Every structure is written in structure tokens, then in C-alpha cells.
Amino acid sequence: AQLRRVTAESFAHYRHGLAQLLFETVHGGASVGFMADLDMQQAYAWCDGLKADIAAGSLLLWVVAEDDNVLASAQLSLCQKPNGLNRAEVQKLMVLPSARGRGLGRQLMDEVEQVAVKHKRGLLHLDTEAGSVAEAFYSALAYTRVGELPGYCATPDGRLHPTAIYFKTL
Ligand SMILES: CC(=O)SCCNC(=O)CCNC(=O)[C@H](O)C(C)(C)COP(=O)(O)OP(=O)(O)OC[C@H]1O[C@@H](n2cnc3c(N)ncnc32)[C@H](O)[C@@H]1OP(=O)(O)O
């Protein structure tokens, strides 16, 4: 497996693997923006929705892949607001259920941080389901927990839960 930054030209190659990754992550129970009704057509639509921003460079996308087999992915959304050029949001960090516990998440976040700095972003922030494995993961990676917002979103099963806000100053 190799860590790769996705570009407009390599997007098609990774499209299916990224869609499958969202699919498996959602059905594995994670709160990443979708409900249990998620099907592959919806996952492909989500993927296609990333293409314009990836080509523009406002959204950065990485995958850890073995050829076209996508094992994990992460995204960095660069704030485009005139007064927000110091910040970026980390989103959609996901590792296939069967590829977890092997350091892929850390590999991705290390790259995300390095590239955020190249883009002169001093603040990385994100939000994740409170109490989830992701919370232990970000804490382990030295992100600082700000607090929670109750009823922020629902797990795929429809149950509302709090989201925890984390940040790291680079
Ligand atoms: C801000 C947003 O981008 S929130 C979106 C969060 N993503 C998701 O919830 C999707 C579902 N969860 C996942 O895909 C994965 O479980 C991820 C990406 C959090 C973890 O990735 P993995 O690749 O398995 O973790 P990695 O193996 O890189 O772990 C880094 C470390 O995190 C911590 N960690 C990971 N999983 C756990 C866990 N189950 N319990 C406690 N600590 C854990 C550990 O300390 C570990 O470092 P140490 O390995 O030396 O033991």
C-alpha cells in the first residue's frame, strides 16, 4: 500500500475504492454524514461531488491504496474565506474496517498535517462523534478536545449523539 494524493487525473482510478470505503465505513456504524439507507449509487454521488474541489485545489484528498484497492482516505478542506486563510478542516478520515489497527489513520493524518503547513494553515480543526474510536485516535495524535455539541448528528441507525470538537495548532 502507498499513501497517494489524489488528483483530477487519478480520481477515476480511485473512485470505486473511495465509494466502497464510505459504504463500508457507514455500514460499520460510523457517523460520517450518512444513514443506514446508503447504497453504492449514493456513495458514487458523494465521490463525484468531490471532483471539482479536488481539481481546484480547495479540497485535498489522499488515499492509502494498493493499486486501485483503497484501504483508507482523508481530506483537508482549505478555508477560502478572506479572513480564514489560517485554517483548514480535516474531514472524512476513514479506514476500511478490516484495515484498521495497522497505523493507516496515523499515516494519513501525518501527511494531512505536513501539507496543511505547506498551505500556510496554522489551525487544523475537526469534529467527530463523541465517545467514538475516532476520539481516542485524535487524542492519541495530540489533538486538543475543545468540548461537545449535543445532538449534532445521528449515527447511521438514526440515534442522535454529541460531536466532539478537536483542533491542533501547527
Ligand atoms: C474529523 C473527522 O475527519 S472524524 C471522522 C472519523 N472517522 C471515523 O470515525 C471512521 C471510522 N473509524 C476509522 O476508520 C478508524 O477507526 C480511524 C481512522 C479513527 C483509526 O484509524 P486506524 O488506522 O485504525 O488507527 P491507527 O491504527 O492509525 O491508530 C493511531 C493510534 O490511534 C489510537 N487508536 C486507534 N484505534 C483505537 C482504539 N480502538 N482505541 C483506542 N485508541 C485507538 C492509538 O493509539 C494508536 O496509536 P498506537 O497505534 O501506537 O497504538
Indicate if ligand 1 lies below 6 Å from the C-beta of 154. no
Cβ 155 vs Cβ 161: under 8 Å: yes
- Between CA 1 and CA 65 the distance in angstroms is 5
State which approach was used to obtain the coordinates. X-ray
Q: Are 77 and 49 in contact (CB under 8 A)?
A: no
Rounded to whole angstroms, the Cα distance separating 69 from 7 reads: 16
**What's 71-101 look like in SS3?**
EEEEEEEECCCCCCCCEEEEEEEEECHHHCC
- Per the structure, the complete domain to which residue 165 belongs is given by 1-170
CATH number for position 30: 3.40.630.30
Cβ–ligand 1 distance for 30 under 6 Å, the answer yes
Task: State the helix-helix crossing angle for 11-27 and 40-48, rounded to 10 degrees.
Answer: 130
Counted domains in the chain: 1
170 is in an annotated binding site: no
Q: How many Cβ atoms sit within 10 Å of the Cβ of residue 91?
A: 17
Q: Is the CB of 106 under 6 A from ligand 1?
A: yes
Nearest-CA residue for atom 50 of ligand 1: 103
